[PDB]
Copies of this chain bind each other. A is one copy, B any other.
Amino acid sequence: LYLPIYATPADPKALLSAAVATSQGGGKLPESFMSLWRFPHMLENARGMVSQLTQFGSTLQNIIERQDAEALNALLQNQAAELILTNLSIQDKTIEEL
């Protein structure tokens, strides 16, 4: 005669992710060296050297952006490859339903 109570499950929790940082110490200056070039020439020299360094910095930024985006491209493929299997199981059980 007694109909039992229809206890019912609650909503799923929101998954949460943790984002931490990394830190690394400040740099240290080399020892300065005295040299035989009057300042205007040693300045045109150093300025050339620096502009070369800036050019390596632009290449490096482009590489960093590219490799990280290509690792995301490979992640989306492995993730859809894993998602397909459940669809195969569902379609198979639809056949048994018919």
**A residues near B, CB below 8 A?**
8-9, 11-12, 14-15, 54-55, 58-59, 65-66, 81, 85, 88-89, 92, 96
Q: Are B59 and A92 in contact (CB under 8 A)?
A: no
User: Contact at B8–A88, with CB atoms within 8 Å?
Assistant: no
Q: Which of B58, B66, B89 contacts A11 (CB 8 A)?
A: B89
Copies in the complex: 6
Within the complex, what minimum Cβ distance (angstroms) separates A6 from chain B? Answer: 9
- Identify whether the interface residues of A are mostly helix, strand, loop, or mixed: helix
Nearest CB of B to A59, in Å: 7
14 residue pairs bridging A and B, Cβ less than 8 Å apart: A8-B96, A9-B92, A11-B85, A11-B88, A11-B89, A11-B92, A12-B85, A12-B88, A12-B89, A14-B85, A15-B81, A54-B55, A58-B59, A65-B66
Q: Which residues of B contact A89 (CB under 8 A)?
A: 11-12
9 shortest interchain CB distances as A-B pairs: A12-B88, A11-B89, A14-B85, A12-B85, A9-B92, A11-B85, A8-B96, A11-B88, A58-B59
